[PDB]
């Protein structure tokens, strides 16, 4: 079966990883108190 | 303190699910040919 020409590679550079992890961890640090209540 | 018993799993999954998503994407970017 012939390959789909609409396929594209995906990227996340290191800075984006660090920015993303910061977002997730700080959001969890913020929301955790309310989850525990 | 009598905290909600689902607070721990809620927090752990809140952290782990998206962090893992990002880690997956980063590592597969690095492994691509340069």
């Amino acid at each position: 079966m012939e390959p789909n020409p609409n396929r594209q590679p995906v990227e996340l550079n290191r800075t984006s990883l660090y920015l993303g992890l910061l977002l997730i961890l700080v959001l969890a640090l913020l929301f955790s108190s309310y989850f525990f209540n | 303190m009598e905290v909600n018993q689902l607070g721990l799993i809620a927090t752990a999954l809140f952290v782990l699910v998206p962090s893992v998503f990002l880690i997956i994407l980063y590592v597969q970017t690095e492994s691509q040919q340069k």
């Binding site: 290191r14 800075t15 660090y18 910061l22 961890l25 | 905290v3 607070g7 721990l8």
Partner: peptide, 30 residues
């Protein structure tokens, strides 16, 4: 358990600071 959770998240953040500073992608002039 809550305290462990809070301290854990905090510790991960400080670790992130470390990697983001010392193991950053080096800025390069092309």
């Amino acid at each position: 358990m809550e305290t462990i959770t809070y301290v854990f998240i905090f510790a991960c953040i400080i670790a992130l600071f470390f990697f983001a500073i010392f193991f950053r992608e080096p800025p390069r002039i092309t």
